[PDB]
Design a protein around this nucleic acid. Structure first.
Lengths: 97, 197, 172, 191, 136, 106
RNA sequence: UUUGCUCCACACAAUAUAGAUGGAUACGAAUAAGGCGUCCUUGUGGCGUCGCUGAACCAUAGCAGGCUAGCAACGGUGCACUUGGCGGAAAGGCCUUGGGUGCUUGCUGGCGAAUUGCAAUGUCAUUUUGCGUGGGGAUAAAUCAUUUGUAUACGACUUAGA
């Protein structure tokens, strides 16, 4: 017989995966798209999570009830000492990636 | 005849080429199939896309990573079509499938070797003209193969280099035919024509 | 049924005291050999007269050849055949070189167009059309035009090897 | 029933030259040049003189000889396009809301802007195919004109301009607003 | 500027087209098409090359580029006469196709001594050819 | 000369088999260059040698031979039948085989 | 942990062979169209020719391919150096310059072969490993134990320690 009572499932099957990672440093599977009319710039940066604190700022969102009004917002601080370049690496297009 | 036969897959039908290559593998001939992205299947594109989706839903219900694996590339579509025609679960069939190398495009070494065709699998000789067909490259791209554009770039590069090669080779055989033209009307040429050569 | 032959069969009912020398009916039968031809003779003569194989006698059985086996003729054929839900009469036209050859492509045509086997077909009359503009069907009128020429495009050559080395050419 | 030989004819007038290597047709004349890839059709072309070209099918069924007259019609359409041009006049119909149709660009893109269709705040933008020009016809109330060489491109831009104004989940026997094709004729008059 | 239209210079099955028979008892002889039965059967007659007058399928012959003038449905003596008039056997033998048939027939009919002499003459020709291909 | 071959190359295809039962006593040999059973009629009775190698030298040589002969044709396409002294061991399905012609009635 | 490791060359033992036994001989595109040659007005051009299968093409004679002599041409080809260039799709191969050394069946000679006895695959390929020899070359890390908790049932992970 059937379920008798529908409910959304517990969990997400696209993160069904739940195992331990390969390292503490998580891999970037996709860097931003390349637009070669720009100057040379890095696409990411490495930092360390220090912790959280609280900010007060004004809202600019016309049409809202807290427009032009102070809101408090949690933020994360990451310590980013300036990263230092030690190598370069070339990748060629193949029919296998 | 040849120790390794390189087959140009362009303009070939999948099942007829897979049948003849399956028999050639089992009889001991080493086969490499190049330009797998230009295979054909008879019937229009929407029919074979529906067939691929019908294959694409068959998977193990309790764990899909042990299921039928739906390889998308034209070489591996061709390889599944061939591996169905060889008894792949025996040592003889595994030995035969080691005698097969399938590539989309034409990579190194096999881009300086002579390619052959198989006339019992050419679409221009098997299908009636006007029957609609499907190119394997657009079908594979439509079902999730990711490298049609890279194969297009590398095949255009190979075509430019091979065109320059053939221009040089055609000039060389022009000189050879010119030098062979003076060799006629002498004694040994007329005696060769007497002896059928 | 096969590559046909045309046999005349002559048969009669057996003589009794009241009727000696009976009336000697004759049929032209298309059949593969003389065994099947004497079967098809009694098959149709039992559909026309009160006889059978036991109350009758095969008098003569002779094979008829085409009187000009190398002249192309337009044959008009009248067929009585059985479908899945009834029986029909048909008139097809066949351009070929003998009455034998027209019947062999009649059974191939009736088995293809209408799924009629040999057991379902009674050939009524195979006659030859003498005059053009007496041809009623347009698939035979195509070949009676003055100065018929046509090409055979897309020539496919059958290979003696499993691998060709140049490319196939489809010219003609 | 596999007809032996059928053919149609294509008239080539005094201005245009048509060129067919394998099955690719090129018609050049006083309003430009048009090409077409007819390689999907398996027909046989033959030039008999510079004012007449036959096109034939040998051993075709019903659908194949049905496609032969389509081939003749397409080549005649290309010829009529490079000689006379093609021009479709469309009209704006509305009950209450004036449709405002203009031409905008976005980095050389040349869009048709349909605005205020049944009082929508949506701004519909139909791209112009390369090879068809638009004239907002003066001295006629509510008319656009689309003219070019190709029936395909001209008639398709007219079809896109008509289909972009499809009626605001309403009764479209009552809400007859839209842009509809009024006339299909040629650029050159007196013909 | 003229109107170039490129293609279709086929060989036509017609009365007077001569053919090479590629299978059957004849299998390699010449014949002439004298009548057309349908799209696939044509009546052929080969009275110089001695094939019988017969109806044949067009998958058993190959049309050669040679034609000559025949009336429709010509009988065998008239096919012989018009064959002798146009001399199509001598036009056939002149072609490179019949030369290739003759070439591979003579090649297969070689004894081993002839094959050795073929090899020797080929070496002697190759020497002079490679010498000539070093000054030009 | 760079060529020394006095036999015709061939391939050990399979045993004589039905769909589900083989017969290891008879083998099927595909002779190179034979396409008809009328071309295969020349090779009937010619002696067939399968030549293989070992690690252990036996009687001076590290090459061993299994001798056989051609018996009859098979099919419509030049496959031929062959019986042996000791049957071929079925790991050689697709192995090269020397078909001699030293009793060549030629 | 008693001179270990690596590359090269030859020196010999083993090891096995999914199966050498002249050569996998490189345009692309179309197939109701093309390949090649040639010419101009360089084109979707004119003219000629070819297909109709690789049955081709190249190579192929010599003690499993010996030893010598000469004639003619300045070619072909193996090997090793060398000059430069191209090739990253899995390039690891292709093209080129120069001289040297070897062979030449392009042509003409002289000598040798047997007896494996009338056949016996009558042994000629490459695949890996090992060992002494001789010539270059370079002189590490990992794990346990200790330690941290960005981790943790245990392993694992993440750190730190001359």
């Amino acid at each position: 017989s059937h379920r008798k009572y529908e409910a959304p499932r517990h969990g997400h099957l696209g993160f069904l995966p739940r195992k331990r990672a390969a390292s503490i440093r998580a891999r970037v599977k996709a860097f931003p798209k390349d637009d070669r009319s720009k100057p040379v710039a890095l696409t990411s940066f490495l930092g360390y999570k220090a912790g959280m604190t609280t900010i007060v700022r004004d809202l600019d969102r016309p049409g809202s009830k807290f427009h032009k009004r102070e809101v408090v917002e949690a933020v994360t601080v990451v310590d980013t000492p300036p990263v230092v370049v030690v190598g370069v690496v070339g990748y060629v297009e193949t029919p296998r990636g | 005849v040849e120790p390794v036969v390189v087959i140009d897959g362009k303009g070939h039908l999948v099942g007829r080429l897979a049948s003849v290559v399956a028999k050639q593998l089992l009889n001991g001939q080493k086969i490499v199939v190049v330009r797998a992205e230009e295979l054909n299947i008879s019937g229009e594109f929407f029919r074979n896309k529906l067939k691929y989706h019908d294959f694409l839903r068959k998977a193990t219900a309790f764990n899909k990573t042990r299921g039928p694996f739906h390889f998308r590339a034209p070489s591996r579509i061709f390889y599944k079509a061939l591996r169905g025609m060889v008894s792949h679960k025996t040592a003889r069939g595994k030995a035969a499938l080691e005698r097969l190398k399938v590539f989309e495009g034409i990579p190194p070494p096999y881009d300086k070797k002579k390619r052959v065709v198989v006339p019992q699998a050419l679409r221009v000789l098997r299908l009636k003209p006007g029957r609609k067909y499907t190119t394997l490259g657009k079908l594979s791209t439509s079902v999730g193969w990711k490298y049609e554009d890279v194969v297009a770039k590398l095949e255009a590069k190979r075509k430019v280099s091979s065109a320059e090669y053939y221009a040089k080779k055609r000039a060389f055989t022009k000189k050879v035919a010119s030098a062979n033209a003076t060799a006629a009307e002498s004694d040994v040429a007329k005696q060769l024509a007497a002896l059928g050569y | 049924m096969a590559h046909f032959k045309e046999y005349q069969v002559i048969g009669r009912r057996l003589p009794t005291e009241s009727v000696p020398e009976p009336k000697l009916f004759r049929m032209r039968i298309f059949a593969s050999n003389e065994v099947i031809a004497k079967s098809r003779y009694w098959y149709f003569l039992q559909k026309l007269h009160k006889v059978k194989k036991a109350s009758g006698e095969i008098v003569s059985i002779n094979q008829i050849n085409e009187a000009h086996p190398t002249k192309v003729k337009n044959f008009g054929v009248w067929v009585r055949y059985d479908s899945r839900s009834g029986t029909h009469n048909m008139y097809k036209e066949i351009r070929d070189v003998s009455r034998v050859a027209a019947v062999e492509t009649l059974y191939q045509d009736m088995a293809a167009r209408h799924r009629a086997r040999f057991r379902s077909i009674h050939i009524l009359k195979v006659a030859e059309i003498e005059k053009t503009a007496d041809v009623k069907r347009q698939y035979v009128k195509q070949f009676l035009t003055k100065d018929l020429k046509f090409p055979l495009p897309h020539r496919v050559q059958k290979s003696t090897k499993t691998f060709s080395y140049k490319r196939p050419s489809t010219f003609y | 029933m596999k007809y032996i030989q059928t053919e149609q004819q294509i008239e080539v007038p005094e201005g245009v030259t048509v060129s067919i290597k394998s099955r690719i047709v090129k018609v050049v004349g006083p309003r430009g040049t048009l090409t077409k890839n007819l390689k999907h059709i398996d027909v046989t072309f033959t030039k008999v003189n510079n004012q007449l070209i036959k096109v034939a099918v040998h051993n075709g069924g019903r659908k194949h000889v049905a496609a032969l007259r389509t081939v003749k019609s397409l080549v005649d359409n290309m010829i009529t396009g490079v000689t006379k041009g093609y021009k479709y006049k469309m009209r704006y119909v509305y009950a209450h809301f004036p449709i405002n149709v203009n031409i905008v660009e976005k980095d050389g893109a040349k869009f048709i802007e349909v605005r205020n269709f049944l009082g929508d705040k949506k701004i519909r933008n139909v791209p112009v195919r390369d090879g068809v020009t638009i004239e907002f016809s003066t001295n006629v109330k509510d008319e656009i004109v689309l003219s070019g060489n190709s029936v395909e491109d001209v008639s398709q831009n007219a079809a896109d301009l008509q289909q972009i104004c499809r009626v605001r989940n309403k009764d479209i026997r009552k809400f007859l607003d839209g842009i509809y094709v009024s006339h299909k004729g040629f650029i050159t008059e007196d013909l | 500027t003229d109107s170039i239209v490129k293609a279709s210079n086929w060989r036509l099955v017609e009365v007077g087209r001569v053919v090479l028979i590629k299978k059957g008892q004849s299998a390699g002889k010449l014949a002439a098409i004298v009548e057309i039965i349908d799209q696939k059967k044509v009546l052929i007659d080969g009275p110089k090359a001695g094939v019988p007058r017969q109806a044949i399928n067009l998958g058993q012959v190959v049309l050669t580029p040679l034609t000559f003038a025949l009336p429709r449905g010509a009988r065998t003596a008239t096919v012989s006469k018009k064959w002798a008039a146009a001399a199509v056997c001598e036009k056939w033998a002149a072609s490179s196709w019949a030369k290739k048939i003759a070439q591979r027939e003579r090649r297969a009919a070689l004894t081993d001594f002839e094959r050795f002499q073929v090899m020797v003459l080929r070496k002697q020709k190759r020497y002079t050819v490679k010498k000539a291909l070093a000054k030009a | 000369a760079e060529s020394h071959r006095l036999y015709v190359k061939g391939k050990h295809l399979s045993y004589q088999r039905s769909k589900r039962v083989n017969n290891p006593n008879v083998s099927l040999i595909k002779i190179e260059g034979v396409a008809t059973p009328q071309d295969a009629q020349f090779y009937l009775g010619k002696r067939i040698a399968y030549v293989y190698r070992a690690s252990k030298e036996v009687r001076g040589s590290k090459i061993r031979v299994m001798w056989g002969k051609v018996t009859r044709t098979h099919g419509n396409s030049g496959v031929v039948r062959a019986t042996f002294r000791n049957n071929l061991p079925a790991k050689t399905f697709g192995a090269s085989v020397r078909i001699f012609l030293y009793p060549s009635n030629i």
